[PDB]
Amino acid sequence: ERGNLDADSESFNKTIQSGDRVFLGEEISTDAGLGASNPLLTGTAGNSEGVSLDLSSPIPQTTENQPLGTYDVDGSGSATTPNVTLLAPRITDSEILTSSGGDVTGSAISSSDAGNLYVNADYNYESAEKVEVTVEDPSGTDITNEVLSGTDTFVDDGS
Amino acid sequence: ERGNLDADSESFNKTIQSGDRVFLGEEISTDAGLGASNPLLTGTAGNSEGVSLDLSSPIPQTTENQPLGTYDVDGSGSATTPNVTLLAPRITDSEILTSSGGDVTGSAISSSDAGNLYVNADYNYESAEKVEVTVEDPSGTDITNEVLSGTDTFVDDGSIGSTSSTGGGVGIDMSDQDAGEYTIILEGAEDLDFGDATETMTLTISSQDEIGIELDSESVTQGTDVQYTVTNGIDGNEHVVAMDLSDLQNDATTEQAKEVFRNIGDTSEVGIANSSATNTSGSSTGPTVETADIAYAVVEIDGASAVGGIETQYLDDS
Amino acid sequence: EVDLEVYDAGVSATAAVGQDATNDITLTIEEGGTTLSSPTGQYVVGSEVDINGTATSSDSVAIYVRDDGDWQLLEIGGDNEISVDSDDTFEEEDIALSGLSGDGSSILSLTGTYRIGVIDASDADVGGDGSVDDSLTTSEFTSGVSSSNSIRVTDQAL
């Protein structure tokens, strides 16, 4: 579903329902959901009032041409009906820790002990999309499949 | 009309009606429509309330002096009457794809196969103006009329992944041109050609020189891993790099020969093959080291080149 | 020498035949030298040697051997051609001229003094399919861009 993404073993979902949250760079799906039943959305209050949000097209970014806020179907009015709030995508904290704790990011580690490392992060967009991990050698090549050990390249929020 | 631009074979139209949308860089027409019946417009809500919008003059840009939003005739009030909403011009995604799919933008392509290319894009301003395509040689000259094949230089909204001239997108036959790096320029028909409304997609043309392979080192000892790169290959297709078992050490085993090639880089599968069957790294079911005769590692390519690696360990000193 | 003539603005195409040109520019046209370097001077029968040379204006090149008659094609192997880089230079790995299969190689097997030359893809089966599959005569080999150099084969002693 949406908001509980790992419950269906999906890395993403774009079937937005009424009252959910939407992020800056999403690409809404025009299939069943709030993408064909109500493709035209208008702002409600603040800097977003009057401004329109076209769900049939990719959503712009950097807080220009799409102000953050709650969006009505009627605009600033007396209706609270199919509904979207627009947030911003964010990664807050992320660390690399050894099998018994201890951050080792940005620091040289012994090759012998670098065999049970972990990668963790906190991200704002958990309802929409998981976050990928891609290890790159100094030469600049994807070595992820060689070094992967588990969790299937997807790291959850928190943790 | 407006909002259905290709319905009248027009590349643009500036006859705005009530309730339509208007973009940042437009130049409204003062003829019949909402350009002489109501030339003065005022904002409604948000940052745009009170601010005026002069339709008789070109509209400013970069979200300064003209805030985005719905505009009334009366301003913030109790009237919902001749009407304009102001959006921003945008190009979201754009790609160059071969006649059977496969993005080739920013990557060198063979001159022989560069004869049925397509250019596609998604743009925000479809009701107002179409977006032009202009191919430029590395010397910086408009060669569009030489390479154009159809669709009349106009690419429609959507139509990303369209491999046929029936859908939106323009085909370019860049086979006749010499080798070099070329830039495809997309911009609006009349007015929407400034930042965020135009995009330059690059393209490299170079001879179909046989697949190139290079090594970061030529003189190495045993145990030292060597990275090999495959160069100038068609994207999305699987090459095969082979290893003659005669160069292998005689005292090697079946499991000892399936690890000559590493899973580093773009390598897909590793193992040893024979003229009849193959023994991959997944299981020791196919030919054995004495039974098999070749060691291989099927490798794909993403872009213009792909990189793999070898284990010079357990290799004959020759 | 090749000249280019420009005409004043507004002139028609038909009416511009007689009027003198406002300005002009001239360039010269020749044909590039496609020559071989390594298969020259001496060759031990049965030995392997690389193909070294240059080709200013070429895409595919073929190697031919002549001795008192036709230029028999030498079957180098894959596609019977060598590509040329941007530096107008083409090269091939170590190839045993006599070892390779074909009747062209058979001439070089016997000890003597012979001739070997390279030719661009202008032949193209002297008109037909896009592949070098012929034994071009003296007139055909000389007509296109080409070059030949004297070669003699010596006996091999361990």
Nearest to A19 by CA among A97, A71, A91: A71
Return d(Cα A17, Cα C125) in angstroms, integer: 68
Residue of B nearest to C90 (CA): B209
A57 with B124: Cβ contact below 8 A: yes
What is the 3-state composition of chain A as percent helix, strand, coil, each rounded to the nearest 5?
10, 25, 65
Give the type of residue at B35: G
Residue A89 CB partners (closer than 8 Å, separation 6+): A23, A24, A25, A123, A124, A125
Give the DSSP letter string of B252-304.
Answer: --HHHHTTSB-S-TTEEEEEEE-SS-EEETT-S-S--TTT--EEEEEE--SSS
Return d(Cα B154, Cα B8) in angstroms, integer: 14
Selected for mutation to probe chain B from A71, A136, A141, A148 (highest B CB count within 10 Å) is A141
Give the type of residue at B313: Q
Against chain C, the chains showing at least 3 CB pairs within 8 Å are B
The CA distances from residue B104 to B138, B171, C30, C90, in Å, are 18, 14, 37, 28
Question: Resolution, in Å, please?
Answer: 11.6
Q: How was this structure determined?
A: cryo-EM
Query: Computed from CA positions of residues C67, C70, C71, C76, in that sequence, does the dihedral angle turn out positive or negative?
Result: negative
Give the DSSP letter string of B30-47.
Answer: -STTTTTS--EEEE-SGG
Nearest to B112 by CA among A5, A128, C60, A123: C60
Give the DSSP letter string of A107-148.
Answer: S---TTTTTS-EEEEEES--SSB-EE---B-TT--B-HHHH-
Residue B70: strand, helix, or coil: strand
Return d(Cα B287, Cα B300) in angstroms, integer: 24
Say if B262 is an interface residue toward chain A (CB within 8 Å): yes
Closest partner residue to B68 (CB to CB) among A58, A65, A142 is A65
Q: Look at strands B69-72 and B84-86 and give their pairing.
A: antiparallel
Could you tell me if B238 and B298 are in contact, meaning their C-beta atoms sit under 8 angstroms apart?
yes
Query: How many angstroms away from the CA of C112 is the closest CA of chain B?
Result: 35
Residue C97 CB partners (closer than 8 Å, separation 6+): C39, C43, C49, C74, C105, C108
Return d(Cα A30, Cα C16) in angstroms, integer: 62
Return d(Cα B68, Cα A49) in angstroms, integer: 10
Q: Look at strands A84-86 and A20-22 and give their pairing.
A: parallel
